[PDB]
Amino acid sequence: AVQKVVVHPLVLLSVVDHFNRIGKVGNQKRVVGVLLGSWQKKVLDVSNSFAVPFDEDDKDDSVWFLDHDYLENMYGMFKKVNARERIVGWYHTGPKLHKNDIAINELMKRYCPNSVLVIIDVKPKDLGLPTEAYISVEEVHDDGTPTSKTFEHVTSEIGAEEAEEVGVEHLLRDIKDTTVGTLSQRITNQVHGLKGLNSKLLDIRSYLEKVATGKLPINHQIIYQLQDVFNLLPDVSLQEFVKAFYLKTNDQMVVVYLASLIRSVVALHNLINNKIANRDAEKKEGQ
């Protein structure tokens, strides 16, 4: 199992590039490639990738051709180029998982005993990362239903080598805004977090709408998880949590006040120095 996975800007760029290549060549709506990386302790760093010729139908959910001969040729060649980048999984640029994903994961597992799929949604997004990482795992159902292979999510994030960071920063030299300030950036992070929480709640609400109306069968694991969450929701009017909140709010506002006073004194010192310099310069000019 892999709890954490780090994808790289080179991987993202190559995935976008492969999607564009296939779009220009024909019309598939999805592209699949192989993903090479390292195995830092319980952390999968996927450093590179290469496209492989993949095709599938839209109806049977079983008619799909993946060229593992091309896969192994390209992998051995990339091994000749660089050795540390071993097969670590595969990627497919679908907006969402597919039925074939389990079979393709088995085909990859024929190569990597612990293969991690990463859906790299090439379509631009706003409230989430572009990579969704999954790992196949057997689901031993408690209700006696037969055990079946299923995809399990693993926390995925984007990280860069030193050179990758240098390159991406050069590319974003004029777009990325760095004159924001730490406080402004953190407030932006807070509002983005609120937006993400709202998006997750809206997804759950839509699923509940579908289930209640009847499109989706009752999923007992999901219902268990939902009621566990709703029970985990805290109470902020207990008359003891309120006292603790006020006590810590004051314990923080005292420090904020001290810092503000110190900043005010420093600003007054700067003003005194500036006015002293101004008078000295003016008097010397008048001399």
Binding site: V16, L171, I187, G193, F245
Partner: protein, 155 residues
């Protein structure tokens, strides 16, 4: 740092020719570096200007780099660690306040070397005090706002 090149012909450079045609004013790349000039630029090879392609789509993922999940956006720092950090930082602020009182005293007193050679090798109470107030105020304001937003949204 990257540069494109193609080689000048020995034949032409001996038979008096410039192996580049100056139709445009695009020969102002960077005032080529002395390293390249001494290593053989403008004699055996020439530099070709380099630009880049902007798609506004790859740039979206390059921006998605450094991005933090809403978990991190809404997480509150460990309150015990936060209190310990505030205590410590206020302690260094106290010491720097003593040193700032000392420095402001013997600042206008004499300024022959105060300009540049009175802080080298010695701590600057004003600068470090500014740094401490900035960092602690950022932390405290951010955690207060996070706590309040959490108290409401997770009700």
């Amino acid at each position: 740092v990257i540069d494109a090149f193609r080689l000048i012909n020995a034949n032409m450079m001996v038979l008096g020719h410039e192996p580049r045609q100056t139709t445009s004013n695009l020969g102002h790349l960077n005032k080529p570096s002395i390293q390249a000039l001494i290593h053989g630029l403008n004699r055996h090879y020439y530099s070709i200007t380099i630009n880049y392609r902007k798609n506004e789509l790859e740039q979206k993922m390059l921006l998605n780099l450094h991005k933090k999940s809403w978990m991190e956006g809404l997480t509150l720092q460990d309150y015990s660690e936060h209190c310990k950090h505030n205590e410590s930082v206020v302690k260094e602020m106290l010491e720097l306040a003593k040193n700032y009182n000392k420095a402001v005293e013997e600042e206008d007193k004499m300024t022959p070397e105060q300009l540049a050679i009175k802080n080298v090798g010695k701590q600057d109470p004003k600068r470090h005090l500014e740094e401490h107030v900035d960092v602690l105020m950022t932390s405290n304001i951010v955690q207060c706002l996070a706590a309040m937003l959490d108290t409401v949204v997770f009700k």
